[model samples]
Target: WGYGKHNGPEHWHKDFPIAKGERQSPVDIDTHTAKYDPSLKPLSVSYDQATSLRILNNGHAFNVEFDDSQDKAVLKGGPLDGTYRLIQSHLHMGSLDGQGSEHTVDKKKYAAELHLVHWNTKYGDFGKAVQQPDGLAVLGIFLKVGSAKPGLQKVVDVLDSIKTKGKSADFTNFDPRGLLPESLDYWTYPGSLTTPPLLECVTWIVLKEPISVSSEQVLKFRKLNFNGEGEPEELMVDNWRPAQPLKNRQIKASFK
Candidate 1:
């Protein structure tokens, strides 16, 4: 049910046929091959700094949830058909700084990848949204080793409290946009979530610029438990899936 030797990404296709579908995610982004489109408008994110409710570790990755019942925070423009409401956000990393991130550019890996999950408003609910091709949009920001990021520290500081699976705490006053890079320039594509059921219903908008984080901070992410209570503790590293075949898809850039 997880990313172990016996049960991992390689075996997911057997249970979920969509795992082998054409629109799989985390593809190798060859920037040189990507086309620059001028009509791709700039991305706009409206996040209520106080909309943060709680953060949880689902034995997979840590998820920070927001109030999505109302359109308090949403993502618009930038290859999106309509406004997508923010449901939650999470981080994907590895044991070492350069080993995580589901998507690779020119075959280069980064320290981590931050995923801000949003669902289409037209579907009325996330449950319905996930079933359609235009149902979801994920904004991915790459994390590289550098000076400690003050904005990121807010989330990292609470990691210890939710270190165990199913562990969560009251999270508040956090603007998800604070974790973004200076540029809104991104690469857009049609793909699925990095994790399973592997539904091919996501519009991926990956930022070209990476935010900075300390190497030690990247290691702190590995402390999260991928096991349940009373079970053998396993490090939650490399939760990312390997890049899938681009096949007939092409990546679009927001910048020239």
Candidate 2:
């Protein structure tokens, strides 16, 4: 459950057997090996600043939840068959700079990784959709340490309010689209969630281009505590799971 020696990704299969299943996520994408699929269309993303509800530290990572009652914010095209409603967005990072991103490019890790999770509308709700193989579509954006990103600073500014697990605050008028890189080009593959319940239901759309963030900014996220009130102090770092076996899956690139 936790990303520790006792229950990290290495030991997840004990409780969540699917952690060892085929089509697992966060695979090391060998850029040279990926096939360029001309048929793959450019990713379509639309976000509503009004739909952003709250941001919380969920013990594992800080997540910004959205109102999915209607399809106001959605992801379409680019390896997806139907429109997927945006539900939540979270991030994973390492304890230090050189090893945070879950999905590495040719074994090169970025400072961190952002996941914008969406669920298929045809499956009723996120709960039901998550169980099917084609239920979810997650947009993975790499966060590299460089110049400061103003859009990311908005999310960082509120991290202080939710420093402990279960702590949350209203996060409104923030559009998730602002976090994306300039390029829509990405690598598409069938994979599972990187965390527990490791369901193989995600169509991972990992962007090739990375957005910049200052080193000081990333350090702020490391200040978050995995423990809640009245518990021992445990900094929430290295929350990302390691790359899993690709096993019969072909990673297709949207661009040449």
Candidate 3:
């Protein structure tokens, strides 16, 4: 549609005209939705760091996971069984002037968005599990901190190093647990993965509150690539997928 500067948000959805106020999500839904499938047994997870961890230089995003810890388990109780194995994590961003995130505001754009892709161990590795609807779970978080503080310093601390094409630091010693928001309180809904094939069985857990990533980190994220040298040399901004159709899905806020 649009053939102008196709960078970050600056170049996103160029063809479509920006509309007026529009409805989108991971919106903050204060109201709670009924938790159906009571028989869908609940699992309590302990926050103990996984002993074995692996990091991947998948290019598009920095994917990570434990040797066998599965994050997509059906809320079961156990140190090994319940831990969801982090498969891959990617980001959505816009251009320097354009919005960075894929999900737009009334078709508008944001600086960027981050997706931590985790697969339910119920199936196995994310590759094997992604085939099923309930096989995958992706945590979507939005980032914004204009004049505020930069939140990305922690991760960006090593960005320059990894920025090199196809290079991965064995963050095995890294603790992703702390990467999560201080508050575990979040909202849930039945939705599909934001990426292709749009598997619908995903149990989405969007953080109620967003944290701030340092502008430097945002820029670092913007510099990311699409994991393809054969691809164009575009600034890796606006990596986000557009706000998907909710399909009448109900987002639920938890009291916990």
Model 3 CA deviation exceeding 4 Å by range? 1-47, 51-59, 69-83, 96-98, 101-110, 146-154, 227-232
lDDT tens readout by residue for model 2, 75-138: 9999899999999999898788998999999999988999999999999999999999999999
Which tens-of-lDDT digit does each residue in 43-106 have in candidate 3?
3433354432544445545445444443332233211234455555565566663565544333
Query: Candidate 1 at residue 123, lDDT?
Result: 98
Candidate 3: clashing residue pairs, number = 31
| Residue 241 local lDDT, model 1 | 87
State the local distance difference test value for candidate 1: 0.88
**TM-score of decoy 3:** 0.65
Every candidate's lDDT: 0.88, 0.91, 0.50
Once superposed on the true structure, which residue ranges of model 2 sit more than 4 Å away at CA?
48-50
Q: Report how far residue 173 has shifted in candidate 1, in Å.
A: 2.6
- Candidates in descending TM-score order: 2, 1, 3
Extract clashing residue pairs from model 2.
Answer: none
- Position 243, candidate 3: lDDT: 57
